[PDB]
Amino acid sequence: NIFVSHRFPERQVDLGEVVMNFAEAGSPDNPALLLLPEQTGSWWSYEPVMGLLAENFHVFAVDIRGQGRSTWTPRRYSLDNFGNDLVRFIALVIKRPVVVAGNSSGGLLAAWLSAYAMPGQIRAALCEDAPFFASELVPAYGHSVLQAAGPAFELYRDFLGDQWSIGDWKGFVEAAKASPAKAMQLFPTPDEAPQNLKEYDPEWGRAFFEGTVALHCPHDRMLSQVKTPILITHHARTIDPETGELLGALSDLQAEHAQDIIRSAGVRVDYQSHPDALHMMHLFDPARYAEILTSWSATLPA
Amino acid sequence: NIFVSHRFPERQVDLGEVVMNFAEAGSPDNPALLLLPEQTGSWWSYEPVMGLLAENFHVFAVDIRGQGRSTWTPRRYSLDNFGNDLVRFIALVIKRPVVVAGNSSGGLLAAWLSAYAMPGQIRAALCEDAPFFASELVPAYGHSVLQAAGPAFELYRDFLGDQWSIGDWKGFVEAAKASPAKAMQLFPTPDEAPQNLKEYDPEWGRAFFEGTVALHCPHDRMLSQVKTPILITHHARTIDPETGELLGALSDLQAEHAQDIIRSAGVRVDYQSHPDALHMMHLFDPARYAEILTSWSATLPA
Ligand SMILES: C[C@@H](O)CCCC(=O)CCC/C=C/c1cc(O)cc(O)c1C(=O)O
Ligand SMILES: C[C@@H](O)CCCC(=O)CCC/C=C\c1cc(O)cc(O)c1C(=O)O
C-alpha cells in the first residue's frame, strides 16, 4: 500500500491467480498496443510515452506479476508464468490482436508471446534492449547473467529479500557502491528506496540470479519458435576492459545470434542499433521510442 | 507415427505452442468433464470408461503435452506449462465450465487448475490417487519423489532418454529387475515397450526425478490456492518396512495434510480411501470410478 497517483486511470483484472493492474489510453479504433515494463519497472514506466502512443494506438500498459499493483506470487516467478498471465490479459481485457513492446525483461516476454501465445494473439513483437542470453544462467552464446547484470540482482536478494522480507535498503546502497562490479553503477542507489523498487518483488532478482526464472525457457529455443515479425533495438553496450563484464543488455555477438535464430525460423526480423541510447529509451527518450515503434508498426501487414 | 486406432474419433487443436489431441463423447446438454491421464498414459487411458461417463457428461479426454499425439516440447515440461495448456484447451474447445478429473500426475493438474485456471473455468476437481508431495523433490511433508516413484523415472531417463533418444528398452527392463527399489515392481516391465509408453516423452520422468517439473509449483502452496471443491481418492498405498519406500501415489500422512491445506483455504474437500483399488482405478474398475465421479458430481452446486 505504498503506491502513488498517476496520469491515467488504473484498473485491475483477475486472470485466475494474478490480479493484473494496468492503464488504458487511446481509441479502440486504433491498433491495440501492449506495453511490458522492464524488471523493477511498473506500468508507469511507459507513462510519459503513453500520451504519444495513444495518438495512434489503443495502448495497454500493465504491471507484470510480482510488480506494481499486480499480485506478488512467491515461488512462481518464471517466464512461462509471466507470459501466460499476459496471454490471459490479452484474452480477457484486450480481446484483439496486439503489437507487443517490452523493455529488457519485458522484451524477453514480448518474444515469449510471439512464440508461445495463443494463436492470433500477437501481430508482431518489439524487443527494446532485451537481455537475450545475457539474462540466462548458462546461455548458448556470450556473457551469462553472472557476468553482466547478476551482481545487482544478487544484492536485491541479499539485502531486500523475497517480498521485501529483509528490507535493508541502506545495506544495499552501501554494498552496491562498494561492489567491485563495474555494471553495478548502471543501477540507481539513492539514499531512499525509489518508488518503482518499493513496488517490486526482489524475488525477481533471485530468480534471474539463480537461473530459475528461465530454466524452462532457453532463449535459443524460444527465439527459434517465434511466429510473428520482431524488431530488436540494441542500445548502449560495452565490454569492460579491466573486468570483462558486459555493461548493457546484450553483446554484439549475442544480438547477431538472436537475429540468425529468428531469421532461420522464417520470420521477419529487423535490427536497429542505437549505441548512444539509454537502456530504457521509452522512459528517458520517449519521443525517440514512439517514433521507432510507430514507424516500424506502420511497415507491418494489416 | 506409432499410434493405434480407438473407439472414439480423435481431433487436434492448436493451443499456440502445443497442438493438443483429444477425444470427445457425449452431448453438450450434459455437464462438461475434462479427463487428465496419468504420466505415461494417453487419453485412451479413459477409453474403456468414457462410454459410461458419456451417458451423463460431455466428456473430453486429452493427450497432455509430451504424450500421445499432443506435441512433444523438449525442456519446457512443467506443471505450469501443463496447466496453462489445459486452460487454453478449455477456453478454445470446451468454452464452458468443466469438472476436471485427473489420475496421478493428472490429478495434480486438476488441482493446479482449481487454483490457477482462468476465473470460472473450473467447477470442481477430482484427484484420482494424486501424488501430492510424494512427487516433489523437496516436499513440505512426507516422502520425496526419490523415496517413491523417482527410481522408475530415473530409469526412464537413463535408458529411454529424452524424446526416446536412447531407446534401450531391454536395458531398462534389465535395470528395473535389478533395482533395489521395492517400488520398482509397481511399474510394468514387458518384453516389448508398451504402446502407452511409446507415445510418451521420457523427459517427463527426468523432470519429476530432477525436481524441475514442480520447482515453480510447490504443492503446499498450490493446495492452499484451490478455489473449487476437491475430491481426493486415495487408492492402494503401503510403506516398505526395510527401505521405507512409499509404494503408491501418496502416504496417509501426506493425504491428511492435503486435506488440511484445502480445508484451511475455506474450500470444500472430500476424501475417499480405497486402499484395495489399483492406481489407475478408472481403467481397471471403470464402473467403480464412474460411480464415484457421477455420485460426487451430483452433490456439486449448480
Ligand atoms: C507408470 C505410472 O503409471 C506410474 C506407476 C503407477 C503405480 O503403479 C504406483 C505409483 C503411483 C504414483 C505414480 C507417480 C509418482 C510420482 O512421484 C509422480 C507421478 O507423475 C506419478 C504418476 O504415475 O503420474
Ligand atoms: C539497471 C537499469 O538502470 C538499466 C541500466 C543499464 C544496465 O543495467 C544494463 C542493461 C541490462 C539492464 C537490466 C537487466 C538485466 C537483465 O539481465 C535482465 C533484466 O530484466 C534487466 C532489466 O529488466 O532491466
Author numbering:
A (entry chain B), B (entry chain A): 25 to 326
The article reads:
As HZEN was found bound at the active site of ZenAScfl H286Y after cocrystallization with ZEN, cocrystallization of wild-type, active ZenARe with ZEN was also attempted. The RMSD compared with the structure without ligand was 0.147 Å (over 251 Cα), and compared with the structure with bound ZLAEN, it was 0.131 Å (over 276 Cα). The structure showed again that the position of the resorcylic acid moiety was well-defined. The lactone ester bond was cleaved, and the aliphatic hydroxy ketone moiety appeared flexible. Residues interacting with the bound ligand were positioned as in the closed conformation of ZenARe with bound ZLAEN. The carboxylate atom O12 was at a distance of 3.1 and 3.1 Å from the N of oxyanion hole residue I and the amide N of oxyanion hole residue II, respectively. The nucleophilic serine Ser-112 appeared in the same orientation as in the structure with ZLAEN bound, with its OG at a distance of 2.7 Å from C12 of the carboxylic acid group. Nonpolar interactions with HZEN were again formed by the residues from the cap domain, with a π–π stacking interaction mediated by Phe-177. Additionally, the catalytic His-303 showed involvement in a weak electrostatic interaction with C12 of the carboxylic acid group of HZEN at 5.1 Å distance.
